[PDB]
């Protein structure tokens, strides 16, 4: 490591260090007691007419006093770019949602947990 620079007179730019890019979070929810029935959360599908495709799947709302409640800390409208390592965007509203319950009973079986990969840009253009 160790490396830098000095000088520069003007700098045709405010500041550039690292290119910005959407962020991703990884939440782990155990399906030990919940798995029995399932996650315990509801999702909603969003369709786009501008594209004519399926934006994907997004959380609807976490049901407190439950299992997901723990992770409920999150907020609905959480696009599921994947789940348990399985992609969703590649699938449709049905399929996708069909995979969840799958991985929920599949991973929650041998594993007992489910991972949720969400994508949230840096900032929703605020300022």
PDB file of C-alpha atoms in Angstrom:
ATOM      1  CA  UNK A   1       0.000   0.000   0.000  1.00  0.00           C
ATOM      2  CA  UNK A   2       1.055   3.563   0.715  1.00  0.00           C
ATOM      3  CA  UNK A   3       0.540   5.925  -2.197  1.00  0.00           C
ATOM      4  CA  UNK A   4      -0.715   9.455  -2.735  1.00  0.00           C
ATOM      5  CA  UNK A   5      -0.127  12.740  -4.521  1.00  0.00           C
ATOM      6  CA  UNK A   6       0.097  16.478  -3.974  1.00  0.00           C
ATOM      7  CA  UNK A   7      -0.075  19.769  -5.837  1.00  0.00           C
ATOM      8  CA  UNK A   8      -2.763  20.410  -8.422  1.00  0.00           C
ATOM      9  CA  UNK A   9      -3.915  23.956  -9.074  1.00  0.00           C
ATOM     10  CA  UNK A  10      -7.569  24.263 -10.014  1.00  0.00           C
ATOM     11  CA  UNK A  11      -9.039  20.776 -10.092  1.00  0.00           C
ATOM     12  CA  UNK A  12     -11.789  20.691 -12.728  1.00  0.00           C
ATOM     13  CA  UNK A  13     -14.059  18.820 -10.348  1.00  0.00           C
ATOM     14  CA  UNK A  14     -15.550  19.113  -6.880  1.00  0.00           C
ATOM     15  CA  UNK A  15     -14.196  15.789  -5.678  1.00  0.00           C
ATOM     16  CA  UNK A  16     -13.744  12.310  -7.099  1.00  0.00           C
ATOM     17  CA  UNK A  17     -12.516   9.361  -5.068  1.00  0.00           C
ATOM     18  CA  UNK A  18     -14.705   6.350  -5.748  1.00  0.00           C
ATOM     19  CA  UNK A  19     -17.480   5.939  -8.289  1.00  0.00           C
ATOM     20  CA  UNK A  20     -20.884   5.744  -6.646  1.00  0.00           C
ATOM     21  CA  UNK A  21     -23.101   2.700  -7.023  1.00  0.00           C
ATOM     22  CA  UNK A  22     -26.251   1.202  -5.556  1.00  0.00           C
ATOM     23  CA  UNK A  23     -25.833  -0.599  -2.252  1.00  0.00           C
ATOM     24  CA  UNK A  24     -26.963  -4.032  -1.130  1.00  0.00           C
ATOM     25  CA  UNK A  25     -27.888  -5.406   2.274  1.00  0.00           C
ATOM     26  CA  UNK A  26     -27.902  -8.990   3.492  1.00  0.00           C
ATOM     27  CA  UNK A  27     -30.402  -9.938   6.172  1.00  0.00           C
ATOM     28  CA  UNK A  28     -30.589 -13.408   7.672  1.00  0.00           C
ATOM     29  CA  UNK A  29     -33.880 -14.725   9.000  1.00  0.00           C
ATOM     30  CA  UNK A  30     -34.057 -18.092  10.776  1.00  0.00           C
ATOM     31  CA  UNK A  31     -36.904 -20.384   9.795  1.00  0.00           C
ATOM     32  CA  UNK A  32     -36.712 -22.751  12.743  1.00  0.00           C
ATOM     33  CA  UNK A  33     -40.042 -22.060  14.404  1.00  0.00           C
ATOM     34  CA  UNK A  34     -41.305 -19.801  11.643  1.00  0.00           C
ATOM     35  CA  UNK A  35     -40.147 -22.070   8.844  1.00  0.00           C
ATOM     36  CA  UNK A  36     -42.865 -24.462   9.948  1.00  0.00           C
ATOM     37  CA  UNK A  37     -45.482 -22.106   8.562  1.00  0.00           C
ATOM     38  CA  UNK A  38     -43.131 -19.835   6.652  1.00  0.00           C
ATOM     39  CA  UNK A  39     -41.353 -16.497   6.773  1.00  0.00           C
ATOM     40  CA  UNK A  40     -44.445 -14.735   8.058  1.00  0.00           C
ATOM     41  CA  UNK A  41     -44.224 -11.691   5.819  1.00  0.00           C
ATOM     42  CA  UNK A  42     -46.223 -10.617   2.789  1.00  0.00           C
ATOM     43  CA  UNK A  43     -44.843  -9.243  -0.456  1.00  0.00           C
ATOM     44  CA  UNK A  44     -46.363  -7.325  -3.345  1.00  0.00           C
ATOM     45  CA  UNK A  45     -45.569  -7.449  -7.044  1.00  0.00           C
ATOM     46  CA  UNK A  46     -44.970  -4.276  -9.016  1.00  0.00           C
ATOM     47  CA  UNK A  47     -45.459  -4.025 -12.762  1.00  0.00           C
ATOM     48  CA  UNK A  48     -44.199  -1.323 -15.094  1.00  0.00           C
ATOM     49  CA  UNK A  49     -46.031  -0.200 -18.209  1.00  0.00           C
ATOM     50  CA  UNK A  50     -43.183   2.021 -19.343  1.00  0.00           C
ATOM     51  CA  UNK A  51     -41.140  -1.128 -19.834  1.00  0.00           C
ATOM     52  CA  UNK A  52     -43.889  -3.722 -20.035  1.00  0.00           C
ATOM     53  CA  UNK A  53     -42.039  -6.065 -17.710  1.00  0.00           C
ATOM     54  CA  UNK A  54     -42.027  -7.017 -14.047  1.00  0.00           C
ATOM     55  CA  UNK A  55     -39.958  -4.666 -11.923  1.00  0.00           C
ATOM     56  CA  UNK A  56     -39.706  -7.613  -9.560  1.00  0.00           C
ATOM     57  CA  UNK A  57     -40.838  -8.394  -6.034  1.00  0.00           C
ATOM     58  CA  UNK A  58     -40.900  -6.030  -3.079  1.00  0.00           C
ATOM     59  CA  UNK A  59     -41.729  -6.451   0.589  1.00  0.00           C
ATOM     60  CA  UNK A  60     -45.247  -5.393   1.502  1.00  0.00           C
ATOM     61  CA  UNK A  61     -44.989  -5.192   5.272  1.00  0.00           C
ATOM     62  CA  UNK A  62     -43.424  -7.090   8.149  1.00  0.00           C
ATOM     63  CA  UNK A  63     -45.722  -8.700  10.689  1.00  0.00           C
ATOM     64  CA  UNK A  64     -44.413  -7.797  14.123  1.00  0.00           C
ATOM     65  CA  UNK A  65     -44.829 -10.157  17.051  1.00  0.00           C
ATOM     66  CA  UNK A  66     -43.528 -12.749  14.620  1.00  0.00           C
ATOM     67  CA  UNK A  67     -40.251 -14.211  13.414  1.00  0.00           C
ATOM     68  CA  UNK A  68     -39.492 -11.801  10.596  1.00  0.00           C
ATOM     69  CA  UNK A  69     -40.293  -9.055  13.075  1.00  0.00           C
ATOM     70  CA  UNK A  70     -36.678  -9.375  14.151  1.00  0.00           C
ATOM     71  CA  UNK A  71     -35.574  -8.324  10.687  1.00  0.00           C
ATOM     72  CA  UNK A  72     -38.795  -6.371  10.320  1.00  0.00           C
ATOM     73  CA  UNK A  73     -36.541  -3.452  11.171  1.00  0.00           C
ATOM     74  CA  UNK A  74     -36.498  -3.073   7.405  1.00  0.00           C
ATOM     75  CA  UNK A  75     -39.252  -1.391   5.428  1.00  0.00           C
ATOM     76  CA  UNK A  76     -41.621  -2.661   2.763  1.00  0.00           C
ATOM     77  CA  UNK A  77     -40.966  -1.955  -0.897  1.00  0.00           C
ATOM     78  CA  UNK A  78     -37.661  -3.734  -0.419  1.00  0.00           C
ATOM     79  CA  UNK A  79     -36.913  -5.070  -3.881  1.00  0.00           C
ATOM     80  CA  UNK A  80     -35.689  -8.646  -3.687  1.00  0.00           C
ATOM     81  CA  UNK A  81     -32.754  -8.797  -6.072  1.00  0.00           C
ATOM     82  CA  UNK A  82     -32.338 -12.331  -4.779  1.00  0.00           C
ATOM     83  CA  UNK A  83     -33.043 -14.685  -1.901  1.00  0.00           C
ATOM     84  CA  UNK A  84     -30.796 -17.305  -0.349  1.00  0.00           C
ATOM     85  CA  UNK A  85     -28.453 -16.597  -3.237  1.00  0.00           C
ATOM     86  CA  UNK A  86     -31.232 -17.228  -5.727  1.00  0.00           C
ATOM     87  CA  UNK A  87     -32.060 -14.443  -8.154  1.00  0.00           C
ATOM     88  CA  UNK A  88     -35.590 -13.110  -8.436  1.00  0.00           C
ATOM     89  CA  UNK A  89     -35.377 -10.246 -10.902  1.00  0.00           C
ATOM     90  CA  UNK A  90     -34.554 -12.882 -13.490  1.00  0.00           C
ATOM     91  CA  UNK A  91     -37.901 -14.440 -12.651  1.00  0.00           C
ATOM     92  CA  UNK A  92     -41.391 -12.978 -12.616  1.00  0.00           C
ATOM     93  CA  UNK A  93     -43.737 -11.937  -9.835  1.00  0.00           C
ATOM     94  CA  UNK A  94     -45.237 -15.404  -9.598  1.00  0.00           C
ATOM     95  CA  UNK A  95     -42.131 -17.483 -10.192  1.00  0.00           C
ATOM     96  CA  UNK A  96     -40.039 -15.262  -7.952  1.00  0.00           C
ATOM     97  CA  UNK A  97     -42.551 -15.383  -5.123  1.00  0.00           C
ATOM     98  CA  UNK A  98     -42.749 -19.077  -5.928  1.00  0.00           C
ATOM     99  CA  UNK A  99     -39.029 -19.403  -5.306  1.00  0.00           C
ATOM    100  CA  UNK A 100     -39.182 -17.719  -1.920  1.00  0.00           C
ATOM    101  CA  UNK A 101     -41.494 -20.247  -0.309  1.00  0.00           C
ATOM    102  CA  UNK A 102     -39.265 -22.773  -2.036  1.00  0.00           C
ATOM    103  CA  UNK A 103     -35.965 -21.612  -0.592  1.00  0.00           C
ATOM    104  CA  UNK A 104     -37.869 -21.042   2.628  1.00  0.00           C
ATOM    105  CA  UNK A 105     -38.707 -24.729   2.811  1.00  0.00           C
ATOM    106  CA  UNK A 106     -35.562 -25.797   0.997  1.00  0.00           C
ATOM    107  CA  UNK A 107     -32.918 -23.738   2.756  1.00  0.00           C
ATOM    108  CA  UNK A 108     -34.924 -23.585   5.961  1.00  0.00           C
ATOM    109  CA  UNK A 109     -34.841 -27.367   5.818  1.00  0.00           C
ATOM    110  CA  UNK A 110     -31.162 -28.210   5.537  1.00  0.00           C
ATOM    111  CA  UNK A 111     -30.106 -24.724   6.565  1.00  0.00           C
ATOM    112  CA  UNK A 112     -32.969 -23.295   8.585  1.00  0.00           C
ATOM    113  CA  UNK A 113     -32.536 -19.708   7.457  1.00  0.00           C
ATOM    114  CA  UNK A 114     -33.241 -17.443   4.507  1.00  0.00           C
ATOM    115  CA  UNK A 115     -31.242 -14.544   3.122  1.00  0.00           C
ATOM    116  CA  UNK A 116     -32.797 -11.457   1.576  1.00  0.00           C
ATOM    117  CA  UNK A 117     -30.789  -9.359  -0.851  1.00  0.00           C
ATOM    118  CA  UNK A 118     -32.171  -5.873  -1.361  1.00  0.00           C
ATOM    119  CA  UNK A 119     -30.942  -3.010  -3.511  1.00  0.00           C
ATOM    120  CA  UNK A 120     -31.187   0.628  -2.499  1.00  0.00           C
ATOM    121  CA  UNK A 121     -29.418   3.390  -4.388  1.00  0.00           C
ATOM    122  CA  UNK A 122     -27.127   5.714  -2.469  1.00  0.00           C
ATOM    123  CA  UNK A 123     -29.793   8.351  -1.954  1.00  0.00           C
ATOM    124  CA  UNK A 124     -33.291   8.986  -3.323  1.00  0.00           C
ATOM    125  CA  UNK A 125     -32.142  12.285  -4.777  1.00  0.00           C
ATOM    126  CA  UNK A 126     -32.484  14.324  -1.607  1.00  0.00           C
ATOM    127  CA  UNK A 127     -31.205  17.851  -1.099  1.00  0.00           C
TER     128      UNK A 127
END
